[PDB]
């Protein structure tokens, strides 16, 4: 679990969301495995806005953050799950590293601030839903 709060956003995995995220709901895709919904209070992440390729990721399952390297947001073919079918996951990045189901939600964040959070895992890899191109989480 986990969430990036931002302004007045909750950022969060789409097949993590509440119905009080349904509820408060400002944009979801499904492609990306992403939902944001309004929040009361303001929030403290502040978003990355790079092209930042090394970061830091948190690992719930280990209970530790990890250094890691990572590819671009693309168009990656994710195994069926609990949650989606087989299919095309957009704007993932993938990097080696330890995830399990309930990893999903940790930030990895570069010096530049949030880049995005854990969405996909499995082997030894772990997969991240990009949020710097997100440019509205910043305003309004
Ligand atoms: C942390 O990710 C791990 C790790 C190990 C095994 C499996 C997973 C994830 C939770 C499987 N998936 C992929 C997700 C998606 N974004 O399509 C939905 C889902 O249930
Ligand atoms: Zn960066």
């Given at each position: 679990?986990?969430?990036?709060?931002?302004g007045?956003?909750?950022?969060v995995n789409?097949?993590?969301?509440?119905?009080?995220?349904?509820?408060?709901?400002?944009?979801?895709?499904?492609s990306?495995?992403?939902?944001?919904?309004?929040?009361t209070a303001?929030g403290c992440?502040?978003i990355?806005r790079?092209?930042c390729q090394?970061?830091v990721?948190?690992?719930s399952?280990?209970?530790k953050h990890?250094?890691?390297?990572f590819?671009?947001?693309?168009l990656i073919?994710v195994?069926?799950?609990?949650?989606?079918?087989?299919?095309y996951?957009?704007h993932?990045?993938?990097?080696?590293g330890?995830?399990?189901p309930?990893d999903?939600?940790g930030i990895?964040?570069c010096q530049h601030?949030?880049?995005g959070?854990?969405?996909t895992?499995?082997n030894?890899?772990?997969?991240?839903?990009?949020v710097?191109?997100?440019?509205?989480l910043?305003e309004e």
């Amino acid at each position: 679990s986990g969430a990036i709060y931002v302004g007045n956003y909750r950022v969060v995995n789409r097949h993590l969301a509440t119905h009080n995220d349904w509820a408060n709901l400002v944009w979801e895709d499904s492609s990306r495995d992403l939902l944001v919904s309004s929040t009361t209070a303001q929030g403290c992440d502040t978003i990355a806005r790079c092209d930042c390729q090394t970061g830091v990721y948190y690992c719930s399952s280990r209970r530790k953050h990890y250094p890691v390297s990572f590819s671009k947001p693309s168009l990656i073919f994710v195994e069926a799950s609990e949650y989606y079918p087989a299919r095309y996951q957009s704007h993932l990045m993938l990097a080696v590293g330890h995830s399990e189901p309930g990893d999903c939600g940790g930030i990895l964040r570069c010096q530049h601030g949030v880049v995005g959070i854990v969405s996909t895992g499995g082997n030894g890899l772990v997969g991240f839903a990009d949020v710097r191109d997100l440019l509205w989480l910043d305003e309004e």
